[PDB]
């Protein structure tokens, strides 16, 4: 007889993956977290003196 | 019913009262050091004494009165006491390490010399030599006590043990006098620090050892010991020899070499 994993395994895997990716992407890009990446190839240096 | 020789102990309140006495003594010392009060400490010391009394009382009940100390149980207690003494040796080792660290490399604050400038050590040939002869003598008398007991001689066991205790007391009184007479104090830099903390812990152990011998004396008076079974006496003798050996190291290191 089919167990919990047979019945719900696919759904648990699919939804878990989708939820995990979606919320981490949101957290990483949408809420003002400053990651402070390298300026190399990103920042144009500006006169400071 | 068991068919092994080991001791299943009755459920006991003394571990909890002992643990609580530790809390009371330590929080008590804190209260004394920081909040000008001896109240907690005196309660802790009291409950500690009560705990020790009843716990060891029960061990006597279990052994002398109830017969639970089979040879296998006795052998365990032998190991227990040896291991305890080893831990005590390592405790003293920390203080000897502190002493040699400071004395072998005296800092500029001391005058760059040992003994430090302004320190006038006791003469190791005076009371410290007397103390040495006293503890060595007590090692001889306790050995006499041990042999008398094994040979079944009640009177000579008692006489030898009394002599041993008297010498322990003599050492303690001599040390107390020496502490009072010493022109240096615990606050006299690292010289005073090492001297009083190391000899002070030793003195405490002499008092502990003497108390243990006094317990054995009264148990002997009450006929608890047989000529073959007397581990409490053996443990007290081992501890007593430990106290003697620590003194010998202190005498050579601090009093003599460090003078």
């Amino acid at each position: 007889a089919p167990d919990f994993h047979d019945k719900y395994g696919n759904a648990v895997l699919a939804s878990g993956a989708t939820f995990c990716v979606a919320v981490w992407v949101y957290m990483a890009t949408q809420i003002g977290i400053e990651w402070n990446p390298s300026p190399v190839g990103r920042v144009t240096p500006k006169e400071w003196r | 019913h068991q068919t092994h020789a080991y001791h299943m102990v009755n459920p006991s309140p003394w571990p909890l009262t002992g643990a609580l006495s530790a809390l009371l003594m330590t929080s008590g010392l804190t209260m004394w050091f920081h909040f000008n009060s001896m109240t907690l400490l005196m309660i802790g010391l009291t409950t500690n004494m009560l705990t020790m009394y009843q716990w060891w009382r029960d061990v006597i009940r279990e052994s002398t009165f109830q017969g639970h100390h089979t040879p296998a149980v006795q052998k365990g207690l032998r190991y227990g006491m040896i291991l305890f003494i080893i831990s005590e040796v390592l405790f003293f080792t920390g203080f000897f390490w502190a002493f040699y660290h400071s004395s072998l490399a005296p800092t500029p604050e001391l005058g760059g010399c040992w003994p430090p400038t302004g320190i006038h050590p006791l003469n190791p040939l005076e009371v410290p030599l007397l103390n040495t002869s006293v503890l060595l003598a007590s090692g001889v008398s306790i050995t006499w006590a041990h042999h008398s007991l094994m040979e079944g001689d009640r009177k000579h066991m008692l006489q030898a043990l009394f002599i041993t205790i008297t010498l322990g007391v003599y050492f303690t009184l001599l040390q107390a006098s020496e502490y009072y007479e010493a022109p240096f104090t615990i606050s006299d830099g690292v010289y005073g620090s090492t001297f009083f903390v190391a000899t002070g812990f030793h003195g405490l152990h002499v008092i502990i050892g003497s108390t243990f011998l006094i317990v054995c004396f009264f148990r002997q008076l009450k006929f608890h010991f047989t000529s073959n079974h007397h581990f409490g006496f053996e443990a007290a003798a081992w501890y007593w020899h430990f106290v003697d050996v620590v003194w010998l190291f202190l005498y050579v290191s601090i009093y003599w070499w460090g003078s």
């Binding site: 919990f4 977290i33 400053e34 990651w35 402070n36 990446p37 | 019913h1 068991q2 068919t3 092994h4 080991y6 299943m8 102990v9 009755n10 459920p11 006991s12 003394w14 571990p15 909890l16 002992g18 643990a19 609580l20 530790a22 809390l23 330590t26 929080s27 804190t30 050091f33 920081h34 909040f35 716990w55 296998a72 052998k75 365990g76 190991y79 227990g80 291991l83 305890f84 080893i86 831990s87 005590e88 390592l90 405790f91 080792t93 920390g94 203080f95 390490w97 502190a98 660290h101 400071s102 005296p106 800092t107 604050e109 430090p116 615990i186 830099g189 690292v190 010289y191 620090s193 903390v197």
Partner: protein, 514 residues
């Protein structure tokens, strides 16, 4: 009956259970402290306050995880439960003194929590170095309460060590030599010897600190001819053996778990494993000054400590390779306990190897007091000691309780924890190499990215910890009672059923000499 059983115990199993409960509660406290650390560091700037409140949290985090979580669980908990069963003994040698080792711990913990509540806490580091820990830079009761907490924990473990050594030496079946005792029993014995010798030296050192703080001694005060570096020697003379004390019972459990879930009757190379644990214990006493490579020590001294520290890799490697050889040819059972043990082998190896990097004093000049050290030891502790604890807990839970865990939940828990701890600690290697110091509440901006990721990692581990509590609840809530356990012929602790009766081995085992 309740008070008689649980406050007045003279029973190794019940006392073991008390230690496991105590350690679990302490683990929650230590976890919260670690999350406060990572919350402070999770973005640039100041969250809580300056370095005082921050280093109070850091100091407490360490003391709690070491003295109240790991030691009580491994030695008090698994040691009390398993050792007498594994040698067929009716209890410990000193069953009543055993109960005092336990009951000294709640007061010790109370003293630590008092230290943090009075004045401004003890923001000293778990090393408690003077003069910062002295009466001028840390005036008031906090540091003295910390010292007293350590005294009580020290006494508890010293008496525990006396108990375990005596029990293991004296209470085996007469036909059983020491070379017929299981590896976990060996690991506890050796750990106990390390405790017996090392704790009294710590006790001496912190007592000297106490008297410097309160009796006007000057052991560590140059004004009196003292030396702050003397404290460091005394502390680390204990502190190195201490980390071997933390891991050895873990090694013992790992040997049992790997053997069991490989379907083997015995670990590979038993006498080599005994040799390795003894060699590690011995060498663990002659290496302490690797914690002091920047204090100004002579060059020849630094050469010796470099070499002696590295040598420990030899017996340690024998154990790692022997675990691999135990897996070899196994009928591998992918139980949650096995996963914990496999995670242990890999993460312990990583942390051991970064230790080897650090043993090079020349390189340690640059890595000392940086996050590279933090990374080193969290790989051996948060992924060594903790993984061995979780492995042993899930493996033996059914023995202790008579109930089963849900294996699927337990595998999920392992997966979350594995991701969390690696995300937390791996980036700290980069922080250390690039020069971020230890014990900082804030960092130059360049260090932002790795600190951010590390803090996110710590939250993943939080989720694992919360899930662990639920999983234990679910097991007790559902009450699936154990029926049969495999391999009892080589795992004596299971042979009296689950849970074993209050009194086991009332009639001892029969073992002949041939």
């Amino acid at each position: 009956m309740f008070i008689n059983r649980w406050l007045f115990s003279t029973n190794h199993k019940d006392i073991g259970t008390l230690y496991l409960l105590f350690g679990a509660w302490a683990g929650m406290v230590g976890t919260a402290l670690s999350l406060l650390i990572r919350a402070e560091l999770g973005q640039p700037g100041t969250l809580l306050g300056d370095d005082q409140i921050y280093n109070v949290v850091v100091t407490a985090h360490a003391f709690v995880m070491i003295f109240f979580m790991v030691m009580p669980i491994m030695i008090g908990g698994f040691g009390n439960w398993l050792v007498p069963l594994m040698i067929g003994a009716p209890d410990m040698a000193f069953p009543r003194m055993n109960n005092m080792s336990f009951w000294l711990l709640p007061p010790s913990f109370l003293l630590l929590l008092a230290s943090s509540m009075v004045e401004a806490g003890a923001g000293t580091g778990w090393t408690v170095y003077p003069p910062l820990a002295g009466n001028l830079a840390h005036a008031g009761a906090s540091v003295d309460l910390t010292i007293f907490s350590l005294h009580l924990a020290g006494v508890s473990s010293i008496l525990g060590a006396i108990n375990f050594i005596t029990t293991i030496i004296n209470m085996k079946p007469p036909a059983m030599s020491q070379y017929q005792t299981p590896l976990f029993v060996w690991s506890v014995m050796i750990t106990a010897v390390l405790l017996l010798l090392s704790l009294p030296v710590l006790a001496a050192g912190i007592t000297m600190l106490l008297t410097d703080r309160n009796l006007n001694t000057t052991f560590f005060d140059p004004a009196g001819g003292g030396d702050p570096i003397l404290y460091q020697h005394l502390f680390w003379f204990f502190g190195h053996p201490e980390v071997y004390i933390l891991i050895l019972p873990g090694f013992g459990m790992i040997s049992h778990i790997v053997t069991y879930y490989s379907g083997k009757k015995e670990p590979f190379g038993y006498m080599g494993m005994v040799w390795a644990m003894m060699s590690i214990g011995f060498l663990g006493f002659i290496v302490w000054a690797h914690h002091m490579f920047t204090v100004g020590m002579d060059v020849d001294t630094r050469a010796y400590f470099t070499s002696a520290t590295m040598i420990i890799a030899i017996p340690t490697g024998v154990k790692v390779f022997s675990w691999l050889a135990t897996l070899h040819g196994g009928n591998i059972k992918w139980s949650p306990a096995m996963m914990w043990a496999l995670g242990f082998i890999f993460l312990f190896t990583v942390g051991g190897l970064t230790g080897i990097v650090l043993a090079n004093s020349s390189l340690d000049i640059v890595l000392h007091d940086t996050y590279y050290v933090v990374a080193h030891f969290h790989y051996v502790l948060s992924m060594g000691a903790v993984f061995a604890i979780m492995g042993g807990f899930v493996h033996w839970f059914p023995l202790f309780s008579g109930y089963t865990l849900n294996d699927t939940w337990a595998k999920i828990h392992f997966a979350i924890m594995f991701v969390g701890v690696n995300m937390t600690f791996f980036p700290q290697h980069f922080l250390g190499l690039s020069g971020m110091p230890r014990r900082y509440s804030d960092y130059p901006d360049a260090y932002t990215m790795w600190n951010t990721i590390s803090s996110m990692g710590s939250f993943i581990s939080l989720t694992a910890v919360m899930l662990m509590v639920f999983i234990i609840w679910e097991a007790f809530a559902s009450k699936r009672e154990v029926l049969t356990v495999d391999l009892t012929t080589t795992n004596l602790e299971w042979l009296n059923g689950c849970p074993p009766p209050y009194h086991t081995f009332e009639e001892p085992t029969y073992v002949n000499l041939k």
